[PDB]
A paper describes a structure:
Here, we show that NmMetQ is a [name] (lipo-NmMetQ) that binds multiple methionine analogs and stimulates the ATPase activity of NmMetNI. The overall architecture of NmMetNI is similar to previously determined structures of EcMetNI, comprising two copies of each TMD and NBD, encoded by MetI and MetN, respectively. Using single-particle electron cryo-microscopy, we determined the structures of NmMetNI in the presence and absence of lipo-NmMetQ.
Reasoning that increasing the nucleotide concentration to above the Km for MgATP would promote complex formation, we mixed equimolar lipo-NmMetQ and NmMetQ in the presence of 5 mM ATP. Under these conditions, we were able to determine the single-particle cryo-EM structure of the complex to 6.4 Å resolution. Despite extensive efforts, we were unable to improve the resolution of this complex. No clear density was seen for the lipid moiety of lipo-NmMetQ or ATP. Under these conditions the ATPase activity is low, showing that unliganded lipo-NmMetQ is not sufficient to stimulate NmMetNI activity.
Residue numbers in the entry:
A (entry chain A), E (entry chain B): 5 to 226
B (entry chain C): 2 to 243
C (entry chain E): 44 to 284
D (entry chain D): 1 to 245
The structure:
């Protein structure tokens, strides 16, 4: 049984420290850009279809069908299509930064469709009250609607992070970096039973933690 | 303050809250409290929204402090909206901000100086007394408090007209006696021209100047309530009095 | 009926374009199963979801058959990807530096060919006499030029030329990026890694397998292979040419 | 009978809950009578009204309803008992995406009655209130008064044994109210006359209550019978409430 | 080049129909189970989160942790771990039915988490009312949870369907499943830009049709 303790600790430490570092930066940075640009687009989807602040049937229809296309079109295939544009922006095709770019594009379009829920669900009459007191549309969104759905936004970001984790592992085998780029080396190929149980353990503890953080804050911010 | 005209109408199974609001017009004079009365719903539970143009009518036009409103662009309509106060059948507030902060909210939209907001909220909170539990949230307090929150929210920006929708009438009469005393002072000092809806006679006789009595999106009568006496002439008016 | 396992690409291409119509002329209904993962095709063979599979090479069959104690055998070699080193950010071999970068496949056995070739370049030394079929970074006796190896997916190696100094290309992606296949700075003479058809060992004598083997050695198949897979390392059955 | 017994709901030092702590309190209500309940919103509009159903549990005290303790039943039998007792509420709480006629049918779906007797009781209690014409309409076709009748009808349908009200006609008009209360008096013809109710106002109470209780901060200061539409209060501070005449 | 592209496409005729015929089975079938068991799981979590029915603190925490552990656990690794069980149940591990089982497993947890949004976010009053009425928890699920929240469920179903389509590309590699296998062919191994553009256009149609269907259903429910 001690075979298991020795086989991992001696070699794997040296790689694990980098494989982890690559993983965190790739999830974190992609998430930030996804939540940022996804917010603005989600707002546009809502405010064009709101028919209260403003309206445009056509722009609403165009933006929805765009968002639909991009949400459903396959991510791995999109990354292969995005290699020239990616290299031209990043200055290279390989590394966590380049993956973070394509991840962020998927996450951008992913985010906004969620937030559509977050707005259609909200109580009507306070909108009429804001309009009754003559605020600019920008003030209504900026300094009302978020706080009212504040608990809703915490949940959405929590679930997006968990999604991007699975996506980052898929992104890493082709582009390099991440625990996926480890797992394919010690599973699928040169498979080792003991090394695989250690990666599984690390994931479990990390993914409880992020969710438990999310639920505690969301609960605090009712 | 005058209407030119208004109406708004609905097809079978078009089905908004009520059947049609008919061709109608009125003048409400300066420094005057004007009451609205009649059986429930009937477009009367809506009619006041048309004054603040919160429903666009199917017909007609309205003038308020000179300006005709229906022709206005939205950015001009903001100032018309800002100067006219309203309060409602439901409490219509920002759940996740405190009571005092809900009271600050319209004054944030007024763009008032931070200390002007702070002073005005402390003033209006104290005028209604609820400064004593203003650092508070809607689960913590009751509907009675929440009425005073509506009142203060409407009051604070010194609007030139108030368009009450049964806010003070919403409480039971015994509780109402202690609050009605407030509105009297507000009118005497600032000539607020306050317009009110009701389905109870008692409050009118103890507060108002003229009453429109109503049914089917239309007038039954307009009556003087002066002398604490409603000088009506129709039997429908007599039923509404009882 | 006959059931085949191949990877996607060149070996499944051999089955799709020529061998499949050849065996149907010979009365056999062929089913092809295509894989993108190395582990599943052999299991499916030993488990009899397949009757045969041409994706395994001589080193890979031995590991997986040993590790999983499988009832399988090779049968015949097949036309195999040459391996070769190509210009990247550096244009000729002599340009190599201490800390130069080389792009290589993340496969253990194809990494073993790469290691054997960098020893033939004399850039690294391997511990010669150690198992060639299972060579790795630890089997580098000395990284003579302190080369910065870059493990990648093989279909990315053609694009990597711009990102790395020299780029080993698998040969499965050299001739599909055929526009640059000629630019090889080095060539592979190693015969330790030939691709090999494989079956459950009990199947080795079957007439259907003899007809697969014959299809894989028919003159029509040779004409098709010369045309489709030009420059590939032939079976020693073909005289390795 | 109802017996109300040393009931309390003490809270924390922060006391950040729905209201300020409420004190150990007791009363008795009879088979033959109507009881009104009156104070200021400082005592709490809610008072202990939610706890009467046992939406809360006495920190001191106990609760006999129809002569049977409810704090002891402590089982699906207590829920079954709850199904048998009538109440209406300050908040309309109506389902939005089913017609209000089917919100009227919703309480009898709880009783599990045969669907034909459901249809019958429904039409009966619905036409007694007179909202049968606007029953098929969803809630985007209404005012408060319609919605009130809906709550009232929802309460009536079981012919429940005992009845509780929650300041209902604060936002309603007299002749509908008068006719509704005349229906409740007909319920006295049925097995029970017990009609417990809160209004902090006098107008209603003077018009038709039998008995009443006057209170502040969880202290009851007097109980008064009403006679010839007069309260006849003995209590001094009670008379500060009677000034609201 | 245009005529060369067009004339090429006609050759692939039968293969395209066989890839598409495969694809419907994977997505449709797996979705059904995902919506089925994910419902129960989300409900059970929610009732043990509340005092309605029975409040079980410990059970709630353990079950919640299990859902987070399984969502965030990597899809591709999970598929490879499932091999021996999958083989015994289905009688095979190759093909679209075996793959759809694995798709659906991921879907149970993802759908239960999605359900949780909608469940926790309902307005209190009607629940409090039926509870005051002494109604049994069965009646609460039978109508009360549904009446409004069913529109948010159409939204949840719509995003889930679109999600299973993306995962079907990744299973398309190992199971040889539908349009994922088709995109792995003449993609990394060979470069036929014409059939890529065709695959893109074919997907684009399916995307628009799915989201347009979801949008209309959710609009019409309220």
């Amino acid at each position: 049984t001690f075979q298991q303790a020795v086989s991992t600790i001696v070699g794997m430490k040296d790689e694990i420290f980098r494989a982890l570092g690559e993983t965190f930066v790739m999830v974190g940075l992609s998430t930030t850009f996804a939540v940022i640009f996804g917010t603005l687009l989600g707002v546009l989807l809502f405010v064009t279809s709101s028919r209260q602040l403003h309206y445009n049937k056509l722009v609403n229809f165009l933006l929805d069908n765009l968002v639909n296309l991009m949400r459903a079109f396959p991510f791995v295939i999109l990354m292969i299509a995005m290699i020239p544009a990616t290299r031209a922006i990043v200055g290279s095709t390989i590394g966590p930064v380049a993956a973070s770019l394509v991840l962020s594009v998927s996450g951008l379009f992913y985010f906004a469709r969620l937030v559509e829920q977050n707005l259609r669900e909200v109580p009507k009459g306070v909108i009429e009250a804001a309009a009754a007191m003559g605020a600019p549309p920008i003030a209504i969104v900026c300094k009302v609607l978020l706080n009212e759905a504040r608990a809703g936004m915490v949940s959405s970001i929590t679930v997006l992070a968990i999604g991007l984790l699975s996506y980052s592992a898929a992104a890493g085998m082709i582009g390099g970096g991440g625990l996926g780029d480890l797992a394919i080396r010690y599973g699928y190929y040169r498979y080792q039973t003991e090394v695989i149980i250690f990666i599984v353990a690390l994931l479990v503890l990390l993914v409880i933690l992020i969710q438990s953080t999310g639920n505690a804050l969301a609960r605090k911010l009712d | 303050i005058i209407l030119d005209k208004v109406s708004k109408h609905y097809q079978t199974r078009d089905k908004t809250r009520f059947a049609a609001v008919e061709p109608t017009s009125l003048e409400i004079r300066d420094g005057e409290i004007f009451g609205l009365m009649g059986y429930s719903g009937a477009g009367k539970s809506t009619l006041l929204r048309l004054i603040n143009l919160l429903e666009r009518p199917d017909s007609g036009k309205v003038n308020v402090c000179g300006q005709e409103l229906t022709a206005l662009d939205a950015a001009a309509l903001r100032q018309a909206r800002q100067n006219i106060g309203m309060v409602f059948q439901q409490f219509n507030l920002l759940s996740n901000r405190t009571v005092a902060d809900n009271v600050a909210f319209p004054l944030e939209i007024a763009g008032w100086p931070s200390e002007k907001i702070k002073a005005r909220v402390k003033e209006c909170l104290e005028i209604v007394g609820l400064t004593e539990r203003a650092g508070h949230y809607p689960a913590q307090l009751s509907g009675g408090q929440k009425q005073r929150v509506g009142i203060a929210r409407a009051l604070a920006p010194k609007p030139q007209v108030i368009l009450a929708d049964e806010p003070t009438s919403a409480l039971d009469p015994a509780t109402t006696r202690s609050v009605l005393e407030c509105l009297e002072d507000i009118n005497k000092r600032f000539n607020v021209t306050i317009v009110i809806v009701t389905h109870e006679m008692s409050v009118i006789r103890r507060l108002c100047d003229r009453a429109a009595l109503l049914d089917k999106g239309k007038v039954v009568e307009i009556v003087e309530v002066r002398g604490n006496q409603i000088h009506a002439q129709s039997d429908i008016g007599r039923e509404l009095i009882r | 009926e006959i059931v085949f396992g191949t990877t996607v690409g060149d070996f499944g291409d051999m089955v799709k374009e020529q061998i499949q119509a050849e065996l149907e002329k010979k009365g056999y209904t062929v089913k092809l199963v295509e894989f993108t993962d190395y582990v599943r095709p052999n299991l499916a063979l030993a488990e009899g979801e397949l009757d045969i599979n041409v994706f395994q090479h001589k080193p890979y069959l031995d590991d997986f058959k040993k590790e999983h104690n499988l009832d399988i055998t090779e049968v015949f070699q097949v036309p195999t990807a040459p391996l070769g080193l190509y210009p990247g950010k550096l244009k000729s071999l002599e340009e190599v530096k201490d800390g130069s970068t080389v792009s290589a496949p993340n496969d253990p056995s194809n990494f073993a060919r790469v290691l054997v070739m960098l020893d033939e370049l004399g850039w690294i030394k391997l511990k010669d006499g150690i198992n060639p079929l299972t060579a790795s970074k630890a089997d580098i006796a000395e990284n003579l030029k302190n080369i910065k190896i870059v493990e990648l997916e093989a279909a990315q190696l053609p694009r990597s030329r711009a990102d790395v100094d020299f780029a080993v290309v698998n040969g499965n992606y050299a001739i599909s990026s055929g526009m640059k296949l000629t630019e090889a700075l080095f060539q592979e003479p190693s015969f330790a890694y030939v691709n090999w058809s494989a079956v459950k060992t009990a199947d080795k004598d079957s007439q259907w397998l003899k007809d697969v083997t014959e299809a894989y050695n028919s003159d029509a198949f040779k004409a098709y292979a010369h045309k489709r897979f030009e420059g590939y390392k032939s079976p020693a059955a073909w005289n390795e040419g």
